[PDB]
């Protein structure tokens, strides 16, 4: 559920989207006080989350966020 690594959460969450695109949703929680980030891609059937702020992930996290946005619109 909590794929606290990389390129395994991305390929699984993208496959959650291609399964059912209408029900899937992705949240993006930011907490600046404590200094952490949180991505979650839930699919009404499963649930994947990703913690670990580690600012070297800030760029690869929002590109993943902005990449899903182009698949909702094509």
């Amino acid at each position: 559920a909590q794929y606290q690594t990389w390129e395994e959460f991305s390929r699984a969450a993208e496959k959650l989207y291609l399964a059912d695109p209408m029900k899937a949703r992705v949240v993006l929680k930011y907490r600046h006080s404590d200094g952490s980030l949180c991505i979650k891609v839930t699919d009404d059937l499963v649930c994947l989350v990703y913690r670990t702020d580690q600012a070297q992930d800030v760029k690869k996290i929002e590109k993943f966020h902005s990449q899903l946005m182009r698949l909702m619109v094509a």
């Binding site: 695109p21 209408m22 899937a24 949703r25 992705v26 949240v27 993006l28 929680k29 930011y30 907490r31 600046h32 006080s33 200094g35 952490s36 980030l37 702020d53 580690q54 600012a55 800030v58 760029k59 929002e62 590109k63 966020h65 902005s66 899903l68 946005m69 182009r70 909702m72 619109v73 094509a74």
Partner: protein, 76 residues
Amino acid sequence: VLLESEQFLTELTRLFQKCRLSGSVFITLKKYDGNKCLLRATDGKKKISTVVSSKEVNKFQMAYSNLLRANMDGLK
């Protein structure tokens, strides 16, 4: 609060400044017709939202990716 794609970015700027001392800022992106996509942001107190279509996605991600990377600074 369903706003325009421009007013959405200025209000999303203040959610990252309001909770700069304490608080979480959520951003929920989802498919929506009733192509388009629905984007919503809520710090817990005030809700804002917009609908982004294929007509303004290129214009959005650019200012949207700049706002996100700038107002998100965590761990080293």
